[PDB]
């Protein structure tokens, strides 16, 4: 579960804050006009007293975080997104000196419920990518030397549900592809595979309607006779002529 | 280290399960474990070389990958393969080889060229497997700790050593009694002779022991036993112990009498056979005490009581002998044997590439000299480069 | 039986297949066949010991499995395995050590032991796998019965015998004629001695000859067959036929003439060999016939005429010998060589543990009286007792 | 094994840390460590015991656990606990004692006993801590493979050794020139001897010479090298060289001449002092050797040239000697010392309870006996077996 | 430097604590004081090494940190951290070294390397902790200065002395009366001779007197005191004050009378014993003053009467003498003692390494050399240079 934590430091032993604090008890000095100084520390000084508290906060999250996080199966490396979500440092203060003895933690039928989806979805990317893979390497040795590309994917990525797909830029999907083209195949699609693989062949002359190819002569041929059909003209071997495909 | 066995295993279980035709089913479960090995790879760059005269080529990575697609090799994709291969086989080869020289006194047992010491990084180990090649299997047990052991064919545990000791002695020669001896690889030939046919001795039996001291302890010993040492049975011109004169030895052979054979360790008798000659097996010991007699026989027909007089001269001396051969035997340290070609592939790189004779071994290779001071040092050393030749025999002979 | 082996191609497969870093896919067939093991046993008590100095551990089973949930192994995995391995080590010694000694004239080709004698129960032969180790390999073929057979370098085939026949001799053994010889593992050495130097024989020439009956037959035997026998060419004093005196032998040795070798087989010659010295192959053959001659030289530098006189007495003893040495042969029947531990890991684990003489086997394992009277149920438990040390090996030597 | 570790340094760091009086907080990252254990164990069922003199008691677990609530502790709350504490000293006790008497040849390094075997069991590691202690400090470090390490004060490196070697003597023992020695524990005294006083000598000298080879290096040796042995220096009637008659040493002491101390490993000097008396340091070595000489005196007073005739009888008798004790040291394998009590904790347990002689220790653990063959069997169980005391001593002394 | 100090705790309070299965908390406060570490360093760069046969390796950082909230540690948490580990140990030991060897006059009291220099730095103060080593518990407090102090046993005062002083004396020296003595460690041994046996003496006693002083103030010393002086109790010859001849020492040995030892500081008497023989205290002494005599017996049986004659020659040599022996004393300086391996390990890594003689310390760190000259210089780089010694023997032995 690779769940990038932080700091015991943080989590409850808090102190960061209590550091933090006595750090801002000895910022009070000169430099320019009066109006500065006094507006500026008086405002510190509400986070001082307030630190008792803000200590609290700390705690908080800490606990929260530290909790539901466990709940994660979808592993989480860092990575820098291209998009933000902007945060009004407007809220950000009023949590701050804003927070009493309040004491709030995750319901447990809630808990349950955030498992419960991530496995789901989980369930889902890892099976559907059974089913893709399956198919693609099937798609080769068939020759079906056609769809491959996006075909496959386009359904892909609709029961994943979570995208709209078009807005992939073209290098997305076919990339998308060259990496799923590159692993095994859950034992239980694969061992299916390489059964009808086998008896492919047998199926296909053992039909009715349709045959493999003709052969020609220009020889007057004896005909030959075999019980099923009576009288007829067939020959399950062709060898000594040209084969062409 | 155990990441350059995989390198391996994989190439020829890589370059003998891909030919024109096969199944793809045949390598599924291979051409992934290969994959992850380039990856890892490409991107880090490599030296190998400088001491003696060994070339120092650089070598870079970045290769594309396989194909999961076909299920049924084309000739053409082996081709693509083989070529990837190549550089890989010229690579390793050249990796086996710089490390395959150097020697440390300290802590001269782990890594040391500048190609290997940055192998056992840590961002590498995604590789290791197969470990079933004998020696690699071997050198995991030691680093976690246990009873490791090799197998060996007339293995090379006694130190050349060929002399003998004279327990009676004068001047002339003419009235000697002592024992003569050849010890070396896997054999002991020991004669005991008494140019007085023990005319005077106690119960007319004179006493014979030779003792050999081994330097490692061999167990599951397979050893032939036999009466008589024919390197010890003919006329032979000796140079006298001070070397200020020579000698003369004229045996005439008699069975050994009260043949007694002890496989001892640390003192303790392990094994002791009686008399017995043919097959017997010595099961762990480290040293080997061989006993025997001369008893002048008591009843002689005229041809013999004429070889046998009651006052010197004695022209005729009585010798009584045996041979020892250890056909196999397994060994807790690596040793030279007559089947493996460890030590001469070892011995011929560093002979071939000019390499400086370094602070560990001695020159040469030599395995008497080796043996003879088997030293920890030593041995960690051997076994280093024992596994690297052994793993250089996978692809390169 | 067949069950034991897996338990080990198991380990052997795994111990080395499973280490910090490969790919999952390497094991996917492999962690299954494992697990499935676990599985089966779990529950089930075993005892092991009971019979000399041999402990009496008591085992129990209850093990978890292994999750598949992985790609990498990472080291946390391995600990967590080597850590039950471990168990099945130090168990499987104590395993094969039990059956390993205990012995059944009836049915000796059979298991017996409270501790397999439960393996062969049907409710566990849910295992076996990998059988490709060569003797194992060679135990199935022969239940079903057929063309079973092994590899041996420097077989093991002749008991030790060492002696000689005088075809001619008279008390004062002064003009003997006859044969002597030393038959040994894979060698045969044979020399025939005329004191006359065939004087008085019809046309100067005395035939010699030597069988030796093989308790095996040997098949696709690579043999090296020289002139002379060394161990034959030395002055001797040796005891008389009747131990009641001591003749004394002083040869000058000729080339053997009209050399004759011929390997047969229930009576036919399968393959002869006329006077040919170096490499010979014997293809199928359970006895050996070799026939030379002493031909006294019809023309004699005067030195040469000073040895052979017309009258006694004889003082310089012609004599022509052999050498045969049997390199390589496959046998149907399991037999110490020169390579293979499994003679001696047997006789070790007996020797070690004290085993009290049981009513197959020879006391000591003794090999000359095992191959002199190698009857069908020594051989049975012999394989079985072979079967198993290979088994050992694979895990611990 | 580890395991075993901290079920001590657990109950140490607990019988001491938890007292009427001291705030939670002060054991807070204590008490949960402990808890955790008693949770592992309730439900698992041990036995100990059976063999000679000891006791063969079963144990059985389910106890509760501990308030993490109060600030203070009560009286109320140590009893409570003390008694539960009871039975895991009683405990570890007879699970030491069990472990500390099983020996073994193949692997007798690691556990042996039904109590220990299953310690080593995956689902217990959940316990290991803070292992400061310096045995298993080393234990660990020994597991990996690293430069090791201990530390001793008058260590006992040397077999009791006591004898002589005539150099020069006659039946009547009256001129006799050679040495006579102690070797024991960490100390060396060696005195050369000449009755003649190198009356007949080049240059009126007598070299002497005495080496001792360790059975095993120290390393970072403070050694006190001083002039004269003073064991060798008063008037002694000693038995022969073949026992059966006694000799007379009368001697008289003079400084010993060029003494020269080597310190050699494996044939290399690697410290050597001349005549350097006092304090010494010797880096690395495997043996000494004592170079030293006997000068007569170029002038002598009357009363001295009284003592040193030209003619027979030599009546006083010229006597040269050094000393040197090792102090402390450093080895990489455990040894006997002046401070540690763990040979004496080991030979005194298997005292008290009758314990049979084994296969591995020579009979009482003479340590004599056990340094003179250091075996890598022997050293492995003593390491076992003085790691197991060391454990023990945490709590019972 | 106190720098240095933590680095190590820190690794062994680590390489101890840390182990597979532990529960997290008891490590919380210790994880965390390890990561503020790797944060300090990684970006800094080293230089380590430069004189005589000193490797001169380079070093780099950039090391992840380390997990928080877990419970058991999984095996696979140890080696991502073990091999980080290493690269520390490896380090500190290149760096230990490097500054083990430098010595500086003017300030040799302080730092000195390109390594160390860097470390007394500010922005490395940053991790200082736990501080009872014993060492640094004793560089600190002398730091800011006070009553710092060490434990030793058999410590290493007295430098090597051993001599004698004819108070009178003649040619013939066939009437001397004097004093011989052996200072050496913690050792004194000295003898009053008067071979008139005080025939002519005032009393019939002379008086002796021996005088040590100590280069160090010790305090809470054991003494062992014992009559007689065995070193001096035999026959000896030995070389005359001027070199020039030698003379004869025979004793006979009497119970020293009016034994009376004065442990003095600064000239005042701290502790004086009269006559008491066994164990006694010195609480705070620099000079040691022994005073016995020799009083002819006034009463003799004829075999002792025999032996003082009236008239010369005088032929048994009267002896009385003393022994004096400090177990165990408190020094302010750093000293070498039976015990502590600090000297050894700075001598040795000298030696290994052929560092060259420096200005402070005498060729060798010799110890008679350097206790005979302690000057402050030299103690002052001898503590600093024991105390890294200690702090490099916490992690290598």
């Known amino acids: ?245 | 280290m155990d990441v350059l066995y995989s390198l391996s295993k994989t190439l020829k279980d890589a370059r003998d399960k891909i030919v024109e035709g096969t199944l793809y089913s045949n390598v599924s479960d291979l051409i992934q474990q290969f994959n992850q090995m380039i990856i890892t790879m490409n991107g880090n760059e490599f030296q190998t070389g400088g001491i003696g005269n060994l070339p120092i080529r650089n070598w870079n990575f970045d290769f594309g990958l396989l194909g999961t697609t076909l299920l049924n090799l084309d000739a053409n994709y082996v081709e693509t393969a083989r070529n990837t291969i190549d550089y890989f086989v010229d690579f390793v080869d050249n990796v086996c080889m710089d490390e395959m020289v150097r020697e440390s006194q300290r802590n001269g047992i782990a890594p040391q060229s500048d190609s290997l010491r940055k192998l056992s990084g840590l961002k590498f180990k995604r590789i290791n497997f197969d470990n079933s090649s004998e020696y690699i299997e071997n050198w995991n047990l030691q680093n976690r700790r246990q009873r490791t052991g090799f197998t060996f064919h007339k293995p090379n545990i006694f130190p050349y050593s060929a002399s003998f000791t004279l327990n009676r002695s004068q001047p002339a020669h003419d009235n000697l009694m002592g024992t003569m001896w050849l010890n070396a690889g896997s054999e002991i030939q020991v004669a005991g002779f008494d140019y007085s046919c023990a005319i005077n001795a106690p119960a007319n039996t004179q006493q014979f022991e030779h003792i050999v001291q081994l330097r490692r302890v061999l167990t599951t010993a397979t050893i032939t036993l036999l009466p008589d040492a024919e390197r010890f049975s003919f006329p032979r011109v000796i140079n006298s112990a001070d070397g200020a004169t020579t000698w003369y030895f004229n045996p005439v052979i008699l069975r050994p009498n009260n043949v007694e054979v002890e496989f001892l360790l640390n003192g303790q008798i392990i094994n002791t056979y009686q008399a017995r000659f043919g097959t017997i097996i010595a099961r762990n010991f480290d040293t080997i005490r061989l006993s025997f007699q001369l008893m002048r026989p008591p009843n002689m027909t005229p041809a013999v009581a004429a070889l046998f007089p009651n006052a010197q001269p004695f022209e005729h001396h009585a010798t009584v002998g045996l041979t020892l051969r250890i056909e196999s035997a397994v060994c807790e340290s690596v040793l030279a044997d007559a089947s493996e070609t460890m030590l001469a592939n070892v011995t011929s790189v560093r002979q071939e590439y000019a390499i400086p004779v370094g602070p560990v071994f001695p020159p040469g290779m030599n395995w008497t000299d080796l043996i003879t001071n088997y030293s920890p040092s030593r041995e960690d050393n051997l076994q280093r480069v024992f596994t690297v030749a052994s793993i250089r025999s996978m692809l390169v002979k």
Do not use: W
């Open chain 1, 1 to 245: 579960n690779q769940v990038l934590n932080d700091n015991i430091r943080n989590g409850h032993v808090i102190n960061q804050l209590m550091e933090a604090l006595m750090q801002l008890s000895r910022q009070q000095f000169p430099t320019m006009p009066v109006d500065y100084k006094r507006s500026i520390q008086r405002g510190i000084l509400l986070l001082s007293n307030r630190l008792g508290q803000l200590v609290d906060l700390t705690r908080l999250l800490a606990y929260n975080y530290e909790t539901l996080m466990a709940c994660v199966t979808m592993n989480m490396q860092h990575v820098q997104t291209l998009t933000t979500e902007k945060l009004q440092l407007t809220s950000v203060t009023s949590l701050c000196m804003l927070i009493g003895n309040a004491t709030v933690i995750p319901s447990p039928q809630t808990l349950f419920h955030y498992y419960n989806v991530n496995v789901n979805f989980h369930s889902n990317y890892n099976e559907r990518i059974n089913d893709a893979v399956a198919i693609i390497t099937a798609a080769n040795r068939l020759n079906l030397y056609q769809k491959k590309m996006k075909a496959i994917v386009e359904d892909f990525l609709k029961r994943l549900h979570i995208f709209d797909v078009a807005r992939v830029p073209d290098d997305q999907m076919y990339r998308l592809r060259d990496r799923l083209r590159l692993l095994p195949v859950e034992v239980r699609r694969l061992d299916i595979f390489n059964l009808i693989l086998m008896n492919m062949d047998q199926i296909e002359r053992a039909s009715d309607k349709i045959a493999q190819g003709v052969i020609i002569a220009y020889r007057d041929m004896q005909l030959e006779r075999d019980e099923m059909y009576g009288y007829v003209n067939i020959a399950r071997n062709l060898d000594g002529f040209q084969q062409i495909n």
